[PDB]
Design a binder for this molecule. Structure first.
Ligand SMILES: Clc1nc2nn[nH]c2cc1Br
Ligand SMILES: [Cl-]
Length: 328
């Protein structure tokens, strides 16, 4: 079918206990050590709070899980434990329960995030290179650990723009990659869904995250956020095809023997592939370079298996100024 070009066998080469999250037995500490201070956020599966550990005054984040989802809890816990110490991955400090209700929660390191909508309108060329490089470190790490994030988007990339700290958060959709495994396509945010998801291709891999990263890069260098702004999942693919081209979409589908939902026939139209320079204008020109466009062109590709890996992206000339500053 399709396989990842990198890290394809790494889970099979590890002990089964590494990836068999259903067999994982977390050690649940006591949530009574934590005082909730402020609600940050809330999703269908969890609610997130700033908190203080009253035993040592440490400020933390507590994510309270909805307890009915036992397999998904084990998955997120095991993934976070496997990733501990990875560069720019949010640090899981502990797994705790309310000692009476037994409702589980995750305790994370605190980061003071700069709201992305405002931030992405004031980044410099160097800043974009720097933060994209830092995010790539996290993705290369998790991919090397056999894990796809599957929900890369600005809201899951915390950036403290004062300390220049970045953390990739919300591992609740992440999964272990196993070659030939068919995965649920109902992952990622609409605007960050790769074409593979939108055409119901289940044999995807780490490269899904590289599409999402490309979407973020485009939004930063062009100042159009989100970059591909679909109204629903059907329209999302139309928005992509109006840039990447319809003949090019059909070549991708043919290569992977992908069946297209016939509702698309009435909405895709006919679109030439657009030059990335078409998105430049006076408001973003200072963020766009030949390097940036070359990198973007190699990320925002229909063919998931031809997109750059996180490592190949990190090795692109676009990041040379960051690497050089990092050593001098
Ligand atoms: Cl703020 C925050 N939110 C999260 N949602 N899932 N994991 C998370 C980690 C942090 Br820190
Ligand atoms: Cl899945």
């Amino acid at each position: 079918g399709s396989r990842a070009r990198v890290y394809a066998e790494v889970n099979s080469l590890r002990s089964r206990e590494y990836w068999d999250y259903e067999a994982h037995v977390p050690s649940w500490g006591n949530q009574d050590d934590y005082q909730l201070v402020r609600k940050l956020g809330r999703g269908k599966y969890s609610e997130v709070f700033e908190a203080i550990n009253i035993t040592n005054n440490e400020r933390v984040v507590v994510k309270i899980l909805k307890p009915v989802k036992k397999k998904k809890i084990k998955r997120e816990v095991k993934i976070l434990e496997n990733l501990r110490g990875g560069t720019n991955i949010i640090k899981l400090i502990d797994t705790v329960k309310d000692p009476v209700s037994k409702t589980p929660a995750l305790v994370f390191e605190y980061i003071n995030n700069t709201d992305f909508k405002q931030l992405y309108q004031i980044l410099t060329d160097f800043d974009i290179r720097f933060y994209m490089y830092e995010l790539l470190k996290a993705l290369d790490y998790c991919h090397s650990k056999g894990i796809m994030h599957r929900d890369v988007k600005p809201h899951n990339v915390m950036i403290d723009h004062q300390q220049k700290k970045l953390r990739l958060i919300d591992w609740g959709l992440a999964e272990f990659y196993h070659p030939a495994q068919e995965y649920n396509v109902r992952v990622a945010s609409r605007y960050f869904k790769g074409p593979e998801l939108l055409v119901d291709y289940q044999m995807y891999d780490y490269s899904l995250d590289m599409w999402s990263l490309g979407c973020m890069l485009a939004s930063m260098i062009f100042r159009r956020e989100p970059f591909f702004h679909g109204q629903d999942n059907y329209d999302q693919l139309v928005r992509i095809a109006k840039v990447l081209g319809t003949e090019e979409l059909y070549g991708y589908l043919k290569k992977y023997h992908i069946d297209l939902d016939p509702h698309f026939n009435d909405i895709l139209g006919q679109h030439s592939r657009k030059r990335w320079e078409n998105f430049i204008h006076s408001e973003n020109r200072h963020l766009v370079s030949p390097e940036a466009l070359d990198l973007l062109d190699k990320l925002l590709r229909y063919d998931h298996q031809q997109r750059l890996t996180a490592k190949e992206a990190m090795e692109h000339p676009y990041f040379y100024p960051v690497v050089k500053e990092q050593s001098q």
